[PDB]
RNA sequence: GUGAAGCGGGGCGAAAGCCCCGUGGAGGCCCGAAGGGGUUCUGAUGUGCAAAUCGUUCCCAUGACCUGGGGCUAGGGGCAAA
RNA sequence: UAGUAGCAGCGAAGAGGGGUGAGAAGCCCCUCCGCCGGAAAGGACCAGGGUUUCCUGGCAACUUCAAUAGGCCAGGAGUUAGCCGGUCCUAAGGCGGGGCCUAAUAGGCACCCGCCGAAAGGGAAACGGGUUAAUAUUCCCGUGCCGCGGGGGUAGGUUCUGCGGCAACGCAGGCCCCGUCCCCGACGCCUCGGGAUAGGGCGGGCGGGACUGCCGUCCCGCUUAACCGUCGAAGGCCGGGGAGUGCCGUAAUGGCGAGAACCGGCCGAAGGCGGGAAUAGCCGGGGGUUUCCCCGGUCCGCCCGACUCCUGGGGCCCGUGAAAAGGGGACGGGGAACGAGCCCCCGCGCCCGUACCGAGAACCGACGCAGGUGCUCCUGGGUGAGAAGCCCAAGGCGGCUCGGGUGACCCCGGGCCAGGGAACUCGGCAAAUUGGCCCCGUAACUUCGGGAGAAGGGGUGCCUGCGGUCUUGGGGUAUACCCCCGGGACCGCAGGUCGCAGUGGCAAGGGGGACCUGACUGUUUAACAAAAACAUAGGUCCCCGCGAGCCCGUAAGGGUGUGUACGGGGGC
RNA sequence: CUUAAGGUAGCCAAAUGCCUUGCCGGGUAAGUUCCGGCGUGCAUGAAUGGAUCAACGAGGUCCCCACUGUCCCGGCCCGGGGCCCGGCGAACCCACCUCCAGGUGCACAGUCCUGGGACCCCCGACGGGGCGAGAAGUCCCUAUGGAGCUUCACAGCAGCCUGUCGUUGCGGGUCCGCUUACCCGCCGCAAGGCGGGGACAGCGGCAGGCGGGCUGUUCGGCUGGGGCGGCACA
């Protein structure tokens, strides 16, 4: 745990306590947000900051939800209706 | 080291238990023939290869 | 002919090192490499982004295509382009061949 | 001790090997592709000599091919005997018309592609000899060979041409390239060593060596190896 | 530098640890066998006739 | 600290263009701490602080850079910008 | 030899008084004096060490001197975890079984199967206060979190489907099993705009402290964790709109019928604020007893602001900057009649580490060794370009473990030296000169980039006023401009004046001409050689079309090769 | 003509020129170095790289300005050693232990000869002597001593090339064909399938060639030291 704090994997956060001491808290970085399977851009509705796995994220109310953006879904539906 | 494996720690424990001279009543019992122990060592001088 | 230099241009980052001939070959290539080109798809006169040697991206229409190491289209590459992109010439020839 | 550098390379030490874990996978034809596919990505692969295209077939099979010059993301390509000879299409060699520039040419069907894979290279389809299932192609070196007519090639030239025309201006630039390749960088001349380390090592005025025969054993077979000739006269006789 | 200064770097590493079979400080952790009794590479006990 | 490509303005001018000022932030770029190295005094030491050190003066210091942990290559063999 | 050398050199050091004791320069207490303060020195901590930790006692030995001291000796004691690490995952790689090879094996490994491989990568969940002689995210108090399981309520369901919004998307969004797909995990370097926090400062207030010659100034406290909720800058997106006499911009690049301006909305950081929480802690004033109780304060208004945290823009690459566990979502298939991601409530969380040093005395170097490892990670104020030096805090040290006297020579390390100025010497070796910043100015030559800080000339302190360019808040009709008030940064002008000297210490280039030589940066004989040697980019030749060429292996087989002539190998 | 050609462009008393401080200029009062020219160049020269210095240099060198305790030529001062006292308390070295002169001697005597001196003890200093101490001389030679390296040494072994024997079978007239052996690749867990080659190749034995890639060795003697020479080696 000391060399583990010499690496920059964790955030170094300096905080003052109610006891008057200034300490360093080593905190996790945010996980990356879900990305569109086509464009790789963050998906709307799910790009909130999350700091651990195992947290349920609600996908937008749309077919294919948090898998592709609305732009990809609409275009793909337009292609299928014709075809 | 701070982070020890138990197997190494138990070998260190054995060396700590054995590092001492014969008791004074042993010296009396043997008419001063037994006064030293081969397990007697100093942490700075005689190094364990633990 | 350049922003602050007479002839060295982009090779000005090398200073007086490596020899005139070497820095001249670099300048000849990089003037085209870092200049403006025409997108093969949208035909806009834009500075295309080179993601890596041989990979070019158009910031206007998003066209991502394979090209030369330092220029988007090599001399021999130009003659064997995909024909889904030579749609302007197919219609130009037909218009001349109809009216 | 005394084994010279070329002899130590064959042991496959880490400094002589290819760091192929830096790449996504081999750039080869799968044995059973057919139909239409889509170019879904075009990528730089460390240590390779050309950009690589990721192609997704209709049945979901993905494979890597060297990107033809002009190929673009989202392009629809066709694989098989029915495919028109358009750039990026993968065709059996017996179906490709003569005079067509092709690349990533299989020598036998299913070997994945062997010839004309470096950036800017291509092979020319010279003739067809279908009574024995052979196609005649000219390779980038100028050599004319026969290949299995059922083997696959891609239409066009390999993208990324012109890379070697720009000088590696600094030692450091080639150093970074070498780290993605297998080359040992840098190299020491033989005559810069002592005799124990090279046939050319030694004398007060160090010299190169005269050519060795083709039968020379390893550790002796350095310098010119059974060369037909040397110098400008050899080039003139080559022509 | 090869003498006293380089001895300073022998303060933190190891080649061998204690062997569970023979108890000597001879188990090569990288090679994963004992340099004295051969445990980890040889189920028979290593002992050569050139050794007294 | 310097100030590449690129980008503004002004001046001269017939055209091309040339000049000045700015903006910009490139480079195995420069000065120089840390860090790395090891040139000089042929300084001190030379039964040493030390079986290779110390002072001083120096070289590099965004990179073919310095450094931790893990891993691979073993003796006629390895590894070697030799 | 000899009671001799050494116990100096590496930029700290002691003194007075008292106590203890047989005995005190040296142990303990106070006072004075000094050293470090981006650290041979303060804070943390890995490996290694292994009890060196703490308490009591002691001085035969041990400590370059002494000793009542001690990392020494004797006796006793001390390390507490669901949430801190290991444990889990895979990396480069490794091992075992099978098989193939082998005279044979404990020898080899391309193949199949499995496993191992990180206390700095990935990765479930804990913070604050108090307590001990010695442990502290582990004990105690308070307030929580994670995983797994259960009970109740609720939404919902019970052939069949959740509701709203044009949309971006919002909202308790039923239950069990299985499958597939996608995404997160998951990533370089350079550079520049924006937002915060840690920290620092200024003015006022309340309390307390310092000093006495004069003044009345100076210093300290005024804090707020995890967790719950809410808000959300950039960026992206949705709807309206429908633009070329253009119109909208940036630190910079710029943007638009391939849909601009403008209007409305959606998703959306660090962090802020409330709750936690003043009941704690701190400061001050009292009373107890053995650490408990009471009382008062814990404030107002501004400024700077990171190397810490967040965000976005731009650029570079013949260089493209891991993988897997795990997790989330969606899309499907099957089943039951019940039943949740919401609220209340119950249960369980094994195993190992945990003391201390972490180094000019706890590691390695035979040592209590000026080396090496680890300055690995962190650091307040003034001056200053500065994480430089110098001075001083917080905090520590006087233990780089001899003391005193004398003031010959000589040695080591420093200072100054009239006149001359390289006459010294192999040689200007050593020393000296120069030195920061601003202005003016700058040659031959040149690969046109450079040469260049070329060279050379001038200025520099303090004080008294007057201005300017911005910035940050508040108040004025008042989002820019303008006026008023408070704070911050930088620049200029006029005048007065002192010194031998104003970059006054500290810090801090001597310069120019020419030849030989290697183009350059780089590398090298660890311990007598740093170079003109090696490498290098560039040039050129050779072997090679891949069942190749070259190389390794007894063999099975292997490297180049996850490669393919713009390529691999081999010379110069 | 000689072992082919017969040193071109250039460059030079060169980090390459012996003679040689070459000759003529520059710079100094005085220049064996340096710079600029000259060149039948002992013995310069083209990727064995020639010419060539922009930029760069802890490279090697010469000149100029500035500067100075480098020097003329030495002086004074500061801190620590030093010296004296208290405390701790080694090592090197050591047959015994040695005043001076001139001799003699294994030819460079503390010890022998003939002289000259010296009252003895103690302190500080130095480095002339003790052929001072350190280290079984690395120089040189000898040894029927090594190691490593070289090749046109004496031998040998791999490796590669080549023939042959076997693997090698089936049809037709040494030739053609075939596939099932065998080989190469793809798919498959395996079974086996597909394609190519094909009695070749590959592999084993035997034989020849190339073979300092690797292994072992030999590289004599005499000698006014060794070496070259000579053969005084029969
Ligand atoms: Mg970790
Ligand atoms: Mg991370
Ligand atoms: Mg030790
Ligand atoms: Mg490599
Ligand atoms: Mg050499
Ligand atoms: Mg050799
Ligand atoms: Mg040879
Ligand atoms: Mg040679
Ligand atoms: Mg060694
Ligand atoms: Mg190891
Ligand atoms: Mg640099
Ligand atoms: Mg020297
Ligand atoms: Mg010396
Ligand atoms: Mg000495
Ligand atoms: Mg520097
Ligand atoms: Mg002394
Ligand atoms: Mg000081
Ligand atoms: Mg002291
Ligand atoms: Mg101080
Ligand atoms: Mg400082
Ligand atoms: Mg410290
Ligand atoms: Mg203690
Ligand atoms: Mg005690
Ligand atoms: Mg003890
Ligand atoms: Mg594991
Ligand atoms: Mg403690
Ligand atoms: Mg105040
Ligand atoms: Mg800017
Ligand atoms: Mg602890
Ligand atoms: Mg000490
Ligand atoms: Mg203090
Ligand atoms: Mg003294
Ligand atoms: Mg003087
Ligand atoms: Mg002189
Ligand atoms: Mg003289
Ligand atoms: Mg000097
Ligand atoms: Mg100074
Ligand atoms: Mg060089
Ligand atoms: Mg050396
Ligand atoms: Mg040296
Ligand atoms: Mg060289
Ligand atoms: Mg050249
Ligand atoms: Mg040659
Ligand atoms: Mg000539
Ligand atoms: Mg020349
Ligand atoms: Mg000459
Ligand atoms: Mg000369
Ligand atoms: Mg010649
Ligand atoms: Mg030469
Ligand atoms: Mg020659
Ligand atoms: Mg040359
Ligand atoms: Mg250099
Ligand atoms: Mg004494
Ligand atoms: Mg005589
Ligand atoms: Mg004698
Ligand atoms: Mg004496
Ligand atoms: Mg001898
Ligand atoms: Mg000897
Ligand atoms: Mg003999
Ligand atoms: Mg055959
Ligand atoms: Mg054979
Ligand atoms: Mg030999
Ligand atoms: Mg003989
Ligand atoms: Mg002889
Ligand atoms: Mg002879
Ligand atoms: Zn485009
Ligand atoms: Zn064992």
Q: What is the DSSP pairing of strand A22-27 with strand E16-17? A: unpaired
Place of tokens 């028979």: E44
Q: Do C82 and D44 touch (CB under 8 A)?
A: no
- Calculate how far, in angstroms, residue A30's C-alpha sits from the geometric centre of ligand 2: 9
Query: DSSP class of residue D41?
Result: E
E9/chain B closest Cα distance in angstroms: 17
- Calculate how far, in angstroms, residue E26's C-alpha sits from the geometric centre of ligand 35: 70
8 A C-beta contact, residue D143 and residue C67: no
Q: Can chain C be said to touch chain D, i.e. do they have 3 or more Cβ pairs within 8 angstroms?
A: yes
d(CA E20, CA E25): 10
What 3-state DSSP class applies to C91?
Answer: helix
Experimental method: cryo-EM
Q: Which residues contact D180 (CB under 8 A, 6 or more apart)?
A: D19, D22, D46, D47
Q: Do C81 and D163 touch (CB under 8 A)?
A: no
Distance of CA C71 to the CA centre of its chain: 4
CA of B44 to C1' of G359 (A): 14
Tokens describing residue B49: 């290869």
Nucleotide lying nearest to C18, CA to C1' measure:
G520
d(CA D79, CA D29): 11
Please tell me which of the candidates C26, C52, C67 has its beta carbon nearest to residue D167.
Answer: C26
8 A C-beta contact, residue C48 and residue C28: no
d(CA E18, CA B8): 9
Which secondary-structure segment (H or E) carries D180?
Answer: helix D171-180
Which secondary-structure segment (H or E) carries C57?
Answer: strand C55-57
Q: What are the DSSP E strand ranges found in D35-143?
A: 35-43, 52-57, 62-66, 76-79, 90-92, 101-103, 123-129, 134-138
d(CA C20, CA C18): 7
Q: For an interface test with C, give the residue of D22, D119, D166 to mutate (most C CBs within 10 A).
A: D166
Q: Do C66 and D163 touch (CB under 8 A)?
A: no
In angstroms, the Cα distances linking D6 to D195, D196, D222 are 15, 14, 8
In angstroms, the Cα distances linking C89 to A3, C85, C95, D140 are 64, 9, 10, 31
Name every chain B residue with its beta carbon within 8 A of the beta carbon of E18.
Answer: 8, 11, 49-50
CA-nearest residue of chain B to E24?
A: B49
DSSP string covering D181-239? SS--SS---GGGS-GGG-TT---SS----PPBPTTPPTTT--SSBS-S--HHHHHHHH-
Q: Name the nearest CA neighbour of E33 among E22, D16, E9.
A: E22
CA angle D220, D221, D222 (to 5 degrees): 100
Burial of D211 per CB tally in 10 Å (0-12, 13-18, 19+): middle
Handedness of CA D163, D168, D172, D174 (dihedral sign): positive
């Amino acid at each position: 745990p000391r060399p583990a704090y010499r690496s920059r994997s964790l955030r170094r956060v300096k905080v003052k306590t109610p006891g008057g001491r200034t300490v360093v808290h080593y905190e996790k970085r945010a996980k990356g947000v879900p990305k569109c399977a086509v464009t790789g851009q963050p998906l709307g509705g799910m790009n909130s900051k999350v700091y651990r796995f195992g947290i349920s994220t609600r996908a937008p109310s749309r077919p294919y939800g948090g898998v592709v953006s609305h732009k990809v879904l609409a275009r793909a539906i337009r292609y299928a209706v014709r075809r | 080291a701070r982070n020890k494996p138990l197997g190494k720690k138990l070998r260190l424990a054995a060396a700590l238990n054995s590092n001492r001279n014969p008791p004074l009543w042993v010296i009396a019992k043997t008419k001063r023939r037994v006064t030293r122990s081969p397990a007697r060592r100093h942490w700075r001088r005689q190094k364990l290869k633990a | 002919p350049f922003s602050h230099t007479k002839i060295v241009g982009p090779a000005g980052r090398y200073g007086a090192r490596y020899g005139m001939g070497i820095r001249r070959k670099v300048t000849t290539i990089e003037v085209k490499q870092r200049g403006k080109h025409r997108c093969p798809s949208c035909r806009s006169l834009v500075r295309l982004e080179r993601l890596a040697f041989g990979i070019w991206h158009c910031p206007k229409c998003g066209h991502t295509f394979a090209g030369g190491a330092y220029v988007p289209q090599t001399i021999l590459g130009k003659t064997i382009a995909p024909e889904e992109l030579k749609g302007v010439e197919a219609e130009k020839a037909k218009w001349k061949e109809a009216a | 001790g005394k084994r010279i550098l070329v002899q130590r390379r064959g042991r496959g030490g880490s400094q002589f090997r290819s760091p192929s874990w830096k790449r996504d996978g081999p750039v080869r034809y799968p044995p059973n592709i057919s139909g239409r596919g889509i170019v879904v990505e075009i990528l730089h692969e460390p240590g390779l000599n050309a950009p690589v295209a990721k192609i997704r077939m209709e049945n979901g099979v993905e494979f890597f091919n060297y990107a033809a010059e002009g190929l673009y993301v989202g392009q629809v390509i066709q694989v098989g005997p029915d495919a028109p000879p358009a750039v990026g299409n993968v065709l059996p060699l017996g179906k490709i018309p003569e005079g067509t520039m092709v690349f990533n040419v299989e020598k036998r069907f299913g070997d994945g592609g062997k010839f004309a894979r470096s950036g800017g290279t291509y092979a020319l389809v010279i003739g067809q000899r279908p009574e024995e299932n052979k196609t005649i192609v000219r390779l980038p070196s100028g050599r004319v060979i026969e290949v299995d007519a059922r083997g696959r090639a891609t239409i066009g030239i390999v993208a990324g041409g012109g890379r070697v025309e720009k000088p590696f201006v600094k030692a450091g630039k080639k150093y970074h390239r070498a780290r993605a390749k297998s080359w040992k960088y840098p190299t020491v001349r033989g005559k810069a060593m002592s005799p124990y380390a090279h046939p050319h090592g030694g004398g007060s005025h160090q010299k190169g060596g005269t050519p060795v025969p083709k039968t020379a054993p390893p550790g002796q077979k350095v310098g010119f190896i059974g060369s037909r000739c040397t110098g400008r006269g050899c080039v003139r006789a080559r022509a | 530098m090869k003498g006293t200064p380089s001895m300073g770097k022998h303060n933190k590493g190891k080649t061998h640890i204690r062997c569970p079979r023979c108890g000597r400080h001879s188990y090569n952790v990288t090679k994963k066998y004992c340099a004295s009794c051969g445990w980890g590479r040889s189920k028979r006990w290593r002992r050569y006739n050139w050794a007294k």
